[PDB]
């Protein structure tokens, strides 16, 4: 149940005070919680990041970060209707397609692309054929791992084709949802990292509140495809910046 006590608050405070002064982690500005679940969660790791909805703290607005958008084959429909809409006309730093993306960016161009952007968002029909195009730098770890979006609010039936349109209000709504919420990727073992909060865009009670939000959404029973994956007793929590130790919370 409820996880906000003096142990959690002291650990998170001491982590911020350590990362302000320590000359070994003055570049990574992030807090992750490591959930040590009881059992091994069974579902294998596809690289599709499911979305954990925070309830009362937008941790990122879609305009304070670089967004790369990856589209389908002809890309003219998505590029024009996204760039001359003025609901979405300034939201994407880049809009490209998979064919000319893998044509242009080969080798160290991918390292420059990694350092250039910080939100990779793909059309869901091309999201699966990305781990060869974007290489393994985007899939080792998870900080620039691409998100699925549906571009049209239209569903495919059998024996008939998806009519090719796109909806800029709908795609702004789901990028707003993506930047407003946090995310996780399931795996086989009992370790699971979830990003919660930033180093100066956030503070201790809101980081603690969204920590408890991710806990509730994860060990929930309903919301079962997207969130109900912790089937057993969640055993431990830790907080860490990417080069910082695992400050423990809630040892059950």
């Amino acid at each position: 149940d409820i996880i906000k006590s003096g142990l959690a608050e002291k650990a998170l405070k001491a982590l911020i005070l350590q990362c302000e002064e320590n000359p070994s982690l003055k570049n990574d500005k992030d807090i992750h919680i490591i959930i040590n679940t009881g059992k091994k969660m069974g579902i294998n790791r596809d690289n599709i990041p499911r979305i954990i909805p925070l309830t009362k703290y937008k941790l990122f607005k879609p305009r304070d970060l670089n967004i790369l958008l990856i589209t389908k084959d002809p890309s003219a429909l998505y590029r024009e209707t996204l760039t001359k809409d003025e609901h979405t006309s300034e939201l994407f730093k880049e809009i490209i397609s998979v064919k000319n993306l893998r044509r242009r960016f080969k080798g160290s161009k991918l390292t420059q692309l990694y350092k250039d952007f910080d939100l990779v968002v793909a059309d869901y029909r091309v999201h699966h054929l990305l781990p060869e195009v974007l290489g393994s730098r985007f899939y080792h770890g998870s900080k620039k791992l691409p998100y699925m979006i549906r571009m049209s609010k239209e569903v495919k039936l059998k024996r008939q084709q998806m009519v090719e349109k796109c909806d800029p209000i709908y795609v702004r709504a789901q990028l707003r949802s993506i930047c407003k919420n946090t995310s996780y990727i399931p795996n086989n073992d009992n370790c699971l990292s979830v990003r919660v909060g930033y180093i100066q865009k956030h503070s201790i009670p809101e980081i603690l509140q969204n920590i408890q939000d991710t806990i509730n959404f994860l060990t929930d029973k309903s919301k079962r495809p997207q969130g109900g994956v912790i089937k057993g007793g969640i055993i431990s929590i830790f907080v860490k910046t990417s080069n910082s130790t695992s400050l423990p919370i809630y040892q059950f």
Binding site: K10, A11, A14, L15, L17, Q18, S244, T245, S246, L247, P248
Partner: peptide, 17 residues
């Protein structure tokens, strides 16, 4: 100080094992 407490804790846990 709690930072150094817990990193010494995991260090001496591994040393004890």
């Amino acid at each position: 100080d709690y930072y150094q407490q817990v990193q010494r804790g995991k260090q001496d846990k591994k040393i004890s094992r």
